Amino acid sequence: GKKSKATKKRLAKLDNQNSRVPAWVMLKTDERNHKRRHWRRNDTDE
Template sequence: MSRSKPSGVKRRLARALKENSAVPAWVILKTNGKFRFNPKKRNWRRNDLKV
């Protein structure tokens, strides 16, 4: 990947990076395990971003 990216691409990559996190433990406890998994979880090798 190139070092210098357009700002739009950089913004979308940053958003994808933030989305790619697990659900916090306190959220799982607060919702009694109803929200346990993040459906937007993504692996960098398996899934490709449409940036």
């Protein structure tokens, strides 16, 4: 398919939200990313 500039920006963001909670945040909060999305198992919008 052919994505537009806006679509691309959104896919970009979704990929970014797909990172893990940084290690330091665990220490800083004395102790999960509920928005983890696999390209195969999950489906994005649009």
